[PDB]
Amino acid sequence: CITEQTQYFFDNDDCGNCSRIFHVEKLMNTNLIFIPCDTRLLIQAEQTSDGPDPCDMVKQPRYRKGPDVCFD
Amino acid sequence: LALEAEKVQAAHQWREDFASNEVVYYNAKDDLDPEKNDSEPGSQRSYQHAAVHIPTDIYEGSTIVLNELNWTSALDDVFKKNREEDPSLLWQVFGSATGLARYYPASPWNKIDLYDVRRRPWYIQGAASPKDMLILVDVSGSVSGLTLKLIRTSVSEMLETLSDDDFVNVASFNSNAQDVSCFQHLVQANVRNKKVLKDAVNNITAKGITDYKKGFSFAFEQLLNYNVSRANCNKIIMLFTDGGEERAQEIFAKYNKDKKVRVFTFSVGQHNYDRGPIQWMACENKGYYYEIPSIGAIRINTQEYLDVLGRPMVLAGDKAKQVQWTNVYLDALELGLVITGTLPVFNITGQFENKTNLKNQLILGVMGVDVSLEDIKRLTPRFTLCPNGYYFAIDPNGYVLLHPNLQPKPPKSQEPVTLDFLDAELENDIKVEIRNKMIDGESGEKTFRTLVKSQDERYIDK
Amino acid sequence: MHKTCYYIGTDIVATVENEKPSPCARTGSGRPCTINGSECRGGWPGPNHGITHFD
Amino acid sequence: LLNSIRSIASLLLLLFLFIIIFALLGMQLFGGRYDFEDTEVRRSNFDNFPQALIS
Amino acid sequence: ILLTIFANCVALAVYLPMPEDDNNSLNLGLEKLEYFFLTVFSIEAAMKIIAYGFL
Amino acid sequence: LQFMFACIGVQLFKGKFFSCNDLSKMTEEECRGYYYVYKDGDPTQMELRPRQWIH
């Protein structure tokens, strides 16, 4: 704590870095590591989206005989 | 299996009578070897005969069951064994409308086997892809908390039933339309996204009168859009409701006539409201209505959620029967995670037969992955999320937290192990450029260093 | 009313009746009443049986 | 025996009336909320007018 | 007045179907109609002004 | 009267009542083998049962 205060000054002078792991004991544990220890898990959801998805294949959907079998 | 199962099914005669000789008995020849597991005894109904799994609720006592059981094994056994002439097929597997055909006698299976096949994802991939999905729960101050519980469970599982590469929302509506927060949808990490949406479903109190049309008004609209993602294809919405009070043909003609829209309406529970306006609707618009009276929810969900979408595939689809590889997941039997390539098999005049597949150990996928010229890492990202990269081990990811309340407890693994490439390993923007480059797959030998800090055991290098 | 309002039990629904640490049971085709209180509780009737309690 | 029915019939009708008012009010009360999540069979619970009649 | 009371009985008997809190359907229009019965009966109250008051 | 209602019920109900478990089987011949029972309501508490038919 106070040692983490001296560490806080050490940060002012190293590398606080959140690093999620989705693995571990089931839960999505976050991991700070500096260049203090594994804790629980949280957060994502996001607002801005990214990482382009793709497909560009098949996607058959056009038809010429959708039988009105319906149900029943 | 395509070329051959098409034939026998074409000449299976399918005569009833039966009773006499099918299959039957129970073969039992002990063995043990590679690919783990001691092959020995396997007949709920290497080499030596074949295992034939059945849904635990499905009973080996029907005109349909045994009738399949004949023609399937009757030829499948032979040529699959012929495929064993060329080692080593790790787990050749057939999956029909109900029962599995496992080649060679791995023994199935106080635990309850709730396991099906219609539900199990590789099979879901084998029928009609992809799917633009837009749910409309009817939260109208009308459903009790009962059918609300049921419907809650219903979405809760259906999204798991839903493909793990198809976009989805949840359009709650009554006296007003509204969405659970996101407004874009989704690609789905399956893990996180579906979990968000699911837990959001977990709190879904009924409250308010049925706008009906207004929900539809956004339904086509939220379905409409164009701005990014979307993943164009089949474009369908799913009502789960007590029973509509009106037709809404007005909006339909207002936004649909190309009929690319579909409607799957799921009346549930008991109630008493007429199925009419609903039954009118799905038939009106290409779409297949059907119910979930209680907790028949599992099999009913799958039963035509896919096959009704199989219609185009039944038609002009035939040259489309290229193998359709799946994302990584754990085997139902102990084995470790294994990719499974699937293909569809057609009937003769009807609505599609059944979806064969091959298990492929990622273990031997690694056997092609040499590890000796080097000593750090391979990594093999999929066409979207995930690789099989030796950057991680063998557990089902998981959402966030939650210790279960011990008090009520005196429903066991679901898979797939979906992962971001981005999250599997440290972000670098430039590296993000790289995965966003490769995800399109465009670039070939393009390569360069990125100076970068790298996580190890529990403290980073650079 | 000191008895009906409470219970304690465990394991298979074979806890002794009417001999200290015993309680009225919910009807049921089996009855166990998860609570938990060890392996399932074993005795309530003021609400699960509905109001009828003498309190 | 049947001749008596002509005498009692009016009172029987008043009984039908009491049945009617009580039924409707019931429908707008119990069934006026009706809902009860978990877990069947619930039986009659005024979810509909005939239902309230039979109950 | 009698037959409109019969209209009361019928309209309400329908009105009970259904409920489940909000939603509503056909009754939603009947909701005015009770005001209709109201104003009629109230007109008969205007007649009651001509009746005998305290007597 | 016992005879009358007897004759009524028989030639109107005789095929009925051969119940399954639950409704999810309908044909008292299609019935066969096991059958889930979920305690309470939560779909994480399955219990098998060699259910059906019912007299």
PDB file of all heavy atoms in Angstrom, chain E residues 2-26, unseen atoms left out:
ATOM      1  N   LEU E   2     -83.490  -1.482 -18.052  1.00  0.00           N
ATOM      2  CA  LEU E   2     -83.240  -2.879 -17.767  1.00  0.00           C
ATOM      3  C   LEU E   2     -82.338  -3.454 -18.835  1.00  0.00           C
ATOM      4  O   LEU E   2     -81.323  -4.074 -18.536  1.00  0.00           O
ATOM      5  CB  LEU E   2     -84.553  -3.661 -17.685  1.00  0.00           C
ATOM      6  CG  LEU E   2     -84.478  -5.113 -17.201  1.00  0.00           C
ATOM      7  CD1 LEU E   2     -85.723  -5.471 -16.404  1.00  0.00           C
ATOM      8  CD2 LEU E   2     -84.310  -6.081 -18.365  1.00  0.00           C
ATOM      9  N   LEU E   3     -82.701  -3.230 -20.087  1.00  0.00           N
ATOM     10  CA  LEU E   3     -81.955  -3.824 -21.176  1.00  0.00           C
ATOM     11  C   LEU E   3     -80.553  -3.247 -21.266  1.00  0.00           C
ATOM     12  O   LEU E   3     -79.615  -3.946 -21.646  1.00  0.00           O
ATOM     13  CB  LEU E   3     -82.697  -3.640 -22.493  1.00  0.00           C
ATOM     14  CG  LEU E   3     -84.064  -4.331 -22.535  1.00  0.00           C
ATOM     15  CD1 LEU E   3     -84.764  -4.068 -23.861  1.00  0.00           C
ATOM     16  CD2 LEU E   3     -83.953  -5.822 -22.261  1.00  0.00           C
ATOM     17  N   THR E   4     -80.399  -1.976 -20.922  1.00  0.00           N
ATOM     18  CA  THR E   4     -79.057  -1.420 -20.903  1.00  0.00           C
ATOM     19  C   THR E   4     -78.261  -1.987 -19.735  1.00  0.00           C
ATOM     20  O   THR E   4     -77.041  -2.094 -19.809  1.00  0.00           O
ATOM     21  CB  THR E   4     -79.056   0.114 -20.842  1.00  0.00           C
ATOM     22  OG1 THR E   4     -77.721   0.588 -21.048  1.00  0.00           O
ATOM     23  CG2 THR E   4     -79.548   0.615 -19.510  1.00  0.00           C
ATOM     24  N   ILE E   5     -78.942  -2.354 -18.654  1.00  0.00           N
ATOM     25  CA  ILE E   5     -78.265  -3.080 -17.590  1.00  0.00           C
ATOM     26  C   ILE E   5     -77.814  -4.437 -18.100  1.00  0.00           C
ATOM     27  O   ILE E   5     -76.756  -4.942 -17.731  1.00  0.00           O
ATOM     28  CB  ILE E   5     -79.162  -3.246 -16.356  1.00  0.00           C
ATOM     29  CG1 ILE E   5     -79.319  -1.907 -15.643  1.00  0.00           C
ATOM     30  CG2 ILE E   5     -78.591  -4.273 -15.398  1.00  0.00           C
ATOM     31  CD1 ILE E   5     -80.347  -1.924 -14.547  1.00  0.00           C
ATOM     32  N   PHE E   6     -78.617  -5.018 -18.977  1.00  0.00           N
ATOM     33  CA  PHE E   6     -78.252  -6.289 -19.559  1.00  0.00           C
ATOM     34  C   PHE E   6     -77.007  -6.067 -20.391  1.00  0.00           C
ATOM     35  O   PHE E   6     -76.107  -6.907 -20.434  1.00  0.00           O
ATOM     36  CB  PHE E   6     -79.391  -6.837 -20.410  1.00  0.00           C
ATOM     37  CG  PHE E   6     -79.119  -8.188 -20.992  1.00  0.00           C
ATOM     38  CD1 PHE E   6     -79.363  -9.331 -20.252  1.00  0.00           C
ATOM     39  CD2 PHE E   6     -78.619  -8.319 -22.274  1.00  0.00           C
ATOM     40  CE1 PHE E   6     -79.122 -10.581 -20.781  1.00  0.00           C
ATOM     41  CE2 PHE E   6     -78.372  -9.569 -22.809  1.00  0.00           C
ATOM     42  CZ  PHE E   6     -78.623 -10.700 -22.061  1.00  0.00           C
ATOM     43  N   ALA E   7     -76.945  -4.899 -21.015  1.00  0.00           N
ATOM     44  CA  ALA E   7     -75.783  -4.528 -21.795  1.00  0.00           C
ATOM     45  C   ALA E   7     -74.589  -4.395 -20.879  1.00  0.00           C
ATOM     46  O   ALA E   7     -73.466  -4.697 -21.263  1.00  0.00           O
ATOM     47  CB  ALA E   7     -76.029  -3.243 -22.542  1.00  0.00           C
ATOM     48  N   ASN E   8     -74.843  -3.957 -19.656  1.00  0.00           N
ATOM     49  CA  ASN E   8     -73.791  -3.888 -18.664  1.00  0.00           C
ATOM     50  C   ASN E   8     -73.252  -5.264 -18.398  1.00  0.00           C
ATOM     51  O   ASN E   8     -72.046  -5.494 -18.443  1.00  0.00           O
ATOM     52  CB  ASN E   8     -74.311  -3.277 -17.369  1.00  0.00           C
ATOM     53  CG  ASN E   8     -74.609  -1.817 -17.505  1.00  0.00           C
ATOM     54  OD1 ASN E   8     -75.716  -1.359 -17.230  1.00  0.00           O
ATOM     55  ND2 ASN E   8     -73.599  -1.060 -17.891  1.00  0.00           N
ATOM     56  N   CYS E   9     -74.169  -6.190 -18.163  1.00  0.00           N
ATOM     57  CA  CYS E   9     -73.790  -7.534 -17.790  1.00  0.00           C
ATOM     58  C   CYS E   9     -72.947  -8.147 -18.881  1.00  0.00           C
ATOM     59  O   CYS E   9     -71.876  -8.690 -18.624  1.00  0.00           O
ATOM     60  CB  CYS E   9     -75.028  -8.385 -17.535  1.00  0.00           C
ATOM     61  SG  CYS E   9     -74.670 -10.075 -17.027  1.00  0.00           S
ATOM     62  N   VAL E  10     -73.416  -8.011 -20.110  1.00  0.00           N
ATOM     63  CA  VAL E  10     -72.736  -8.629 -21.227  1.00  0.00           C
ATOM     64  C   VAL E  10     -71.376  -7.995 -21.448  1.00  0.00           C
ATOM     65  O   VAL E  10     -70.361  -8.685 -21.561  1.00  0.00           O
ATOM     66  CB  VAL E  10     -73.570  -8.516 -22.505  1.00  0.00           C
ATOM     67  CG1 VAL E  10     -72.804  -9.069 -23.692  1.00  0.00           C
ATOM     68  CG2 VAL E  10     -74.885  -9.247 -22.328  1.00  0.00           C
ATOM     69  N   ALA E  11     -71.361  -6.670 -21.472  1.00  0.00           N
ATOM     70  CA  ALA E  11     -70.146  -5.947 -21.793  1.00  0.00           C
ATOM     71  C   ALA E  11     -69.081  -6.222 -20.765  1.00  0.00           C
ATOM     72  O   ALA E  11     -67.905  -6.300 -21.090  1.00  0.00           O
ATOM     73  CB  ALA E  11     -70.415  -4.468 -21.877  1.00  0.00           C
ATOM     74  N   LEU E  12     -69.499  -6.381 -19.520  1.00  0.00           N
ATOM     75  CA  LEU E  12     -68.546  -6.653 -18.465  1.00  0.00           C
ATOM     76  C   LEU E  12     -68.078  -8.088 -18.520  1.00  0.00           C
ATOM     77  O   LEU E  12     -66.901  -8.376 -18.303  1.00  0.00           O
ATOM     78  CB  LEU E  12     -69.150  -6.345 -17.105  1.00  0.00           C
ATOM     79  CG  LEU E  12     -69.435  -4.856 -16.940  1.00  0.00           C
ATOM     80  CD1 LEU E  12     -70.085  -4.572 -15.601  1.00  0.00           C
ATOM     81  CD2 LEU E  12     -68.161  -4.059 -17.109  1.00  0.00           C
ATOM     82  N   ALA E  13     -69.003  -8.986 -18.829  1.00  0.00           N
ATOM     83  CA  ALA E  13     -68.668 -10.394 -18.897  1.00  0.00           C
ATOM     84  C   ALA E  13     -67.618 -10.589 -19.964  1.00  0.00           C
ATOM     85  O   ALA E  13     -66.721 -11.412 -19.831  1.00  0.00           O
ATOM     86  CB  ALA E  13     -69.896 -11.220 -19.196  1.00  0.00           C
ATOM     87  N   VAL E  14     -67.720  -9.799 -21.017  1.00  0.00           N
ATOM     88  CA  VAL E  14     -66.704  -9.827 -22.040  1.00  0.00           C
ATOM     89  C   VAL E  14     -65.457  -9.144 -21.521  1.00  0.00           C
ATOM     90  O   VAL E  14     -64.340  -9.591 -21.765  1.00  0.00           O
ATOM     91  CB  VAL E  14     -67.182  -9.136 -23.310  1.00  0.00           C
ATOM     92  CG1 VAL E  14     -66.075  -9.107 -24.342  1.00  0.00           C
ATOM     93  CG2 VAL E  14     -68.406  -9.841 -23.851  1.00  0.00           C
ATOM     94  N   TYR E  15     -65.663  -8.077 -20.757  1.00  0.00           N
ATOM     95  CA  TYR E  15     -64.570  -7.210 -20.350  1.00  0.00           C
ATOM     96  C   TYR E  15     -63.591  -7.971 -19.500  1.00  0.00           C
ATOM     97  O   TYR E  15     -62.401  -7.677 -19.495  1.00  0.00           O
ATOM     98  CB  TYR E  15     -65.093  -6.010 -19.596  1.00  0.00           C
ATOM     99  N   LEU E  16     -64.102  -8.967 -18.791  1.00  0.00           N
ATOM    100  CA  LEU E  16     -63.253  -9.800 -17.962  1.00  0.00           C
ATOM    101  C   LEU E  16     -62.257 -10.536 -18.835  1.00  0.00           C
ATOM    102  O   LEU E  16     -61.159 -10.862 -18.397  1.00  0.00           O
ATOM    103  CB  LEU E  16     -64.084 -10.779 -17.157  1.00  0.00           C
ATOM    104  N   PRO E  17     -62.656 -10.799 -20.073  1.00  0.00           N
ATOM    105  CA  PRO E  17     -61.785 -11.450 -21.034  1.00  0.00           C
ATOM    106  C   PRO E  17     -61.122 -10.409 -21.912  1.00  0.00           C
ATOM    107  O   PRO E  17     -61.783  -9.786 -22.733  1.00  0.00           O
ATOM    108  CB  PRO E  17     -62.564 -12.434 -21.878  1.00  0.00           C
ATOM    109  N   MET E  18     -59.823 -10.204 -21.728  1.00  0.00           N
ATOM    110  CA  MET E  18     -59.065 -10.871 -20.681  1.00  0.00           C
ATOM    111  C   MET E  18     -58.614  -9.847 -19.653  1.00  0.00           C
ATOM    112  O   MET E  18     -59.405  -9.029 -19.192  1.00  0.00           O
ATOM    113  CB  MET E  18     -57.874 -11.600 -21.263  1.00  0.00           C
ATOM    114  N   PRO E  19     -57.335  -9.891 -19.307  1.00  0.00           N
ATOM    115  CA  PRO E  19     -56.760  -8.916 -18.395  1.00  0.00           C
ATOM    116  C   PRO E  19     -55.242  -8.948 -18.469  1.00  0.00           C
ATOM    117  O   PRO E  19     -54.646  -8.318 -19.339  1.00  0.00           O
ATOM    118  CB  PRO E  19     -57.228  -9.173 -16.982  1.00  0.00           C
ATOM    119  N   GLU E  20     -54.630  -9.696 -17.554  1.00  0.00           N
ATOM    120  CA  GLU E  20     -53.179  -9.854 -17.497  1.00  0.00           C
ATOM    121  C   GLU E  20     -52.471  -8.509 -17.465  1.00  0.00           C
ATOM    122  O   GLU E  20     -51.559  -8.271 -18.254  1.00  0.00           O
ATOM    123  CB  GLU E  20     -52.695 -10.674 -18.665  1.00  0.00           C
ATOM    124  N   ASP E  21     -52.906  -7.649 -16.547  1.00  0.00           N
ATOM    125  CA  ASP E  21     -52.444  -6.262 -16.431  1.00  0.00           C
ATOM    126  C   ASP E  21     -52.825  -5.427 -17.657  1.00  0.00           C
ATOM    127  O   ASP E  21     -54.006  -5.225 -17.924  1.00  0.00           O
ATOM    128  CB  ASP E  21     -50.936  -6.209 -16.193  1.00  0.00           C
ATOM    129  N   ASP E  22     -51.830  -4.947 -18.397  1.00  0.00           N
ATOM    130  CA  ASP E  22     -52.067  -3.998 -19.486  1.00  0.00           C
ATOM    131  C   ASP E  22     -52.669  -4.635 -20.742  1.00  0.00           C
ATOM    132  O   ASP E  22     -53.732  -5.249 -20.689  1.00  0.00           O
ATOM    133  CB  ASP E  22     -50.775  -3.295 -19.837  1.00  0.00           C
ATOM    134  N   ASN E  23     -51.980  -4.463 -21.867  1.00  0.00           N
ATOM    135  CA  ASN E  23     -52.409  -4.991 -23.163  1.00  0.00           C
ATOM    136  C   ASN E  23     -53.810  -4.556 -23.560  1.00  0.00           C
ATOM    137  O   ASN E  23     -53.983  -3.537 -24.224  1.00  0.00           O
ATOM    138  CB  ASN E  23     -52.328  -6.496 -23.171  1.00  0.00           C
ATOM    139  N   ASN E  24     -54.794  -5.363 -23.169  1.00  0.00           N
ATOM    140  CA  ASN E  24     -56.198  -5.175 -23.532  1.00  0.00           C
ATOM    141  C   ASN E  24     -56.424  -5.282 -25.037  1.00  0.00           C
ATOM    142  O   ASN E  24     -55.488  -5.201 -25.829  1.00  0.00           O
ATOM    143  CB  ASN E  24     -56.715  -3.840 -23.012  1.00  0.00           C
ATOM    144  N   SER E  25     -57.677  -5.476 -25.424  1.00  0.00           N
ATOM    145  CA  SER E  25     -58.009  -5.663 -26.828  1.00  0.00           C
ATOM    146  C   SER E  25     -59.331  -4.998 -27.188  1.00  0.00           C
ATOM    147  O   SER E  25     -59.405  -3.780 -27.322  1.00  0.00           O
ATOM    148  CB  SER E  25     -58.056  -7.139 -27.158  1.00  0.00           C
ATOM    149  N   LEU E  26     -60.369  -5.809 -27.361  1.00  0.00           N
ATOM    150  CA  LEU E  26     -61.686  -5.306 -27.736  1.00  0.00           C
ATOM    151  C   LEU E  26     -62.319  -4.420 -26.666  1.00  0.00           C
ATOM    152  O   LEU E  26     -63.029  -3.469 -26.981  1.00  0.00           O
ATOM    153  CB  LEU E  26     -62.608  -6.465 -28.055  1.00  0.00           C
TER     154      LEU E  26
END
